[PDB]
Design a protein around this ligand. Structure first.
Ligand SMILES: [Zn+2]
Lengths: 246, 76, 284
């Protein structure tokens, strides 16, 4: 509803990016704009509802929708691109990725916490149920965007999302595919404020939903940790990463 | 003294500015503030409530979590 | 097709920034969401006349209808009985107005980013005319264009933007003064020249009315136009076509993007990341 509609002939450089659960993401350059948008397609009603949802929630930490492709031969949804890809490439592949700095992963966690906080702080609120490290999207400078709302249901509440945030926190501090054990080998003692993170991860995936953290409490207890760092390391660790790529 | 609403209001001192529920709303809900963090509790059960839901009201969450309230039973 | 509203009790910490044409720019920290969120407001706790109420309503509606990743998104509004203010997202690094007009804070800014942000703004404005009927921003300047942490630039302040209909600073006017789409091209050219030059045009404004309309342009001098910057003549041609006297020959934004593309082919993202540090530390 009230979203722009563009024809499929305005797309060029059809290149494969990823195959999402709710539909594949194609790296297709536009024609009038000439930018490698993330066209989503293969379900037609499902992707229409997806476009409606992305139009409903609009935050800088969610990739802004740009229009829809209403054509009989092919239906598509246009969003921005991802040059460095998702977190899966950053963490699960360490053969050529040598190291990832602590400030980067902590900033990623803070961004995810804020995004799902707002996602739970709408009128009426929303639940994700599809928050995974592969779903987290890194921009040109690794800022977090959240996509694939297919399992996001309009509204067990505030449980799957916070559990996903906890497991992804442990994942990006451990860089190991997944209850996960939190020993020193997985979580070395060099991590600043380590015991805080251990308490966080055990709280997040608690069996009892009653004690399950809310995202608001998560962000209000995590803020001093990101307060400890500075912008210099934030802007330098990405440079070190890119230099190590070549 | 905790029965009096003024007691809850004065216990709601130093309430943080980021809270989504005004002390008056909690006092109408029958809750008080311990003084530590955002911990609140009702005089009927004593159950301590945390992890504030921004869109949920105190009355609704007290009813959902603890439907055994004498305060809610009188309210209903 | 619905724009959620924001109660005034949730928002906190109103901080003054500036006063624009469509409101008074301010910054705030949204307490419930724990997000720093900027705001703008014509008036504070005054009888809200229906004229400005309709103005801000249509502003919010047009911002919500067509949102681009290269324009600043809209968060919401406060429909208070006495106070009116637009709640929009806060990009931490701010805008280019002080960035391009503070020599002490920014003695030097690297030309790779200086041209890459031009690509971003060109993409945004080209999209802004792709939605039927084409939108004419009418107020696109250095202030409206604003950047986030990583200097990704977004535009805002659509308040005086007027949609094009077919039913047939005062120094920022184009020689056109009938709404013409080429005013966007003219604004893009002047901001393109302002980015590299870091010089404010019109530096008595009464003569500008008879000067810019007749054909006069801000002075061209070697100190502000040095040959050291590569592709200097290309951007000279781009701007001279951008602020032409009439809309017949000014290139479409696609043509300007195509012309600028070879200029931007001379950079790598590693250069951009290296160049953000110098700017981020010289402003300290
Ligand atoms: Zn109770």
């Amino acid at each position: 509803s009230a979203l722009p509609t563009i024809p499929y002939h305005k797309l060029a450089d059809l290149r494969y990016l990823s195959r999402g659960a709710s539909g594949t993401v194609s790296s297709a350059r536009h024609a009038d704009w000439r930018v490698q948008v993330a066209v989503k397609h293969l379900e037609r009603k499902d992707v229409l509802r997806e476009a409606e949802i992305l139009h409903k929630a609009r935050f800088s930490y969610i990739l802004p929708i740009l229009g829809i492709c209403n054509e009989p031969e092919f239906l598509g949804i246009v969003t921005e691109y991802m040059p460095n890809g998702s977190l899966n490439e950053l963490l699960h592949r360490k053969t050529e990725y040598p190291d990832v700095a602590w400030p980067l992963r902590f900033r990623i966690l803070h961004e995810i916490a804020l995004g799902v906080n707002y996602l739970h702080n709408m009128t009426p609120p929303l639940l994700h149920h599809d928050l995974k490290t592969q779903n987290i999207l890194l921009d040109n400078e690794f800022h977090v965007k959240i996509a694939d709302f297919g399992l996001s249901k309009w509204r067990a509440s505030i449980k799957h999302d916070i559990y996903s945030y906890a497991v992804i926190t442990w994942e990006v501090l451990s860089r190991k595919q997944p209850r996960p054990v939190i020993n020193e080998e997985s979580l070395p003692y060099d991590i600043p404020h380590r015991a805080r993170m251990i308490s966080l991860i055990e709280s997040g995936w608690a069996q009892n939903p009653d004690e399950r953290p809310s995202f608001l409490k998560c962000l209000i207890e995590l803020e001093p940790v990101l307060r400890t760092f500075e912008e210099i390391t934030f802007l330098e660790a990405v440079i070190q990463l890119k230099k190590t790529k070549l | 003294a905790m029965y009096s609403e003024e007691a809850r209001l004065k216990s709601f001192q130093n309430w943080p500015d980021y809270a989504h529920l005004t002390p008056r709303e909690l006092a109408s809900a029958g809750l008080y503030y311990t003084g530590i963090g955002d911990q609140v509790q009702c005089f009927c059960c004593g159950g301590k409530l945390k992890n504030w839901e921004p869109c949920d009201r105190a009355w609704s969450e007290h009813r959902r979590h603890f439907p055994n309230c004498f305060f809610v039973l009188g309210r209903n």
